Every structure is written in structure tokens, then in C-alpha cells.
């Protein structure tokens, strides 16, 4: 393969569907109530498991879970 380039052009998802994948569906609002209507923003240098505990979420052994997820989105350069 080797394919060095920048125009991926991927199916962009919402918060609703990416928490409906981990399988935390409960904290829909949660996040959607601390202005958290970005999911290219997720995952760089916000929404950490500091975050998570901020929000309100306590449950450590989800915390954890949605660490990876948002680790695993994807992540690039915000210039507006």
C-alpha cells in the first residue's frame, strides 16, 4: 500500500452514534450539556479522564472507556 497524502474522506460521526458504539449511550446529554457538540475535537488535548470526572461522570470504569474511544478519533489542526 504506502499511501502519503491528505485526503482521506471519511464518514464524519456525531457524538449521539459515537457514544451509542462504546455502549454509553446514558451520557448523551451529559457532554451535549458542557458544550461538547465537536467530535474532531475530541481526542488532542480536552476531554481527558480529568474531564470526564468534571463533566460529571464518575463511573471510573467507564471513564476509562471513552478515554480510548477518544483517543482513537481522528485528530488534526484546528485554524479558524
Known amino acids: 500500500g504506502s499511501s502519503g497524502s491528505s485526503g482521506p474522506r471519511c464518514p464524519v460521526q456525531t457524538v449521539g452514534q459515537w457514544l451509542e458504539s462504546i455502549g454509553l449511550p446514558?451520557?448523551?446529554?451529559?457532554?451535549?450539556?458542557?458544550g461538547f457538540d465537536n467530535v474532531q475535537f475530541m481526542g488532542?488535548?480536552?476531554?481527558?479522564?480529568?474531564?470526564?470526572?468534571?463533566?460529571?461522570?464518575?463511573?471510573?470504569g467507564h471513564r476509562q472507556r471513552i478515554l480510548?474511544?477518544?483517543q482513537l478519533l481522528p485528530s488534526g489542526p484546528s485554524s479558524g
Open 26 to 34: 446514558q451520557y448523551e446529554n451529559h457532554l451535549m450539556a458542557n
Open 44 to 60: 488532542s488535548n480536552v476531554m481527558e479522564d480529568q474531564d470526564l470526572l468534571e463533566i460529571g461522570i464518575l463511573n471510573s
Open 68 to 70: 480510548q474511544a477518544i
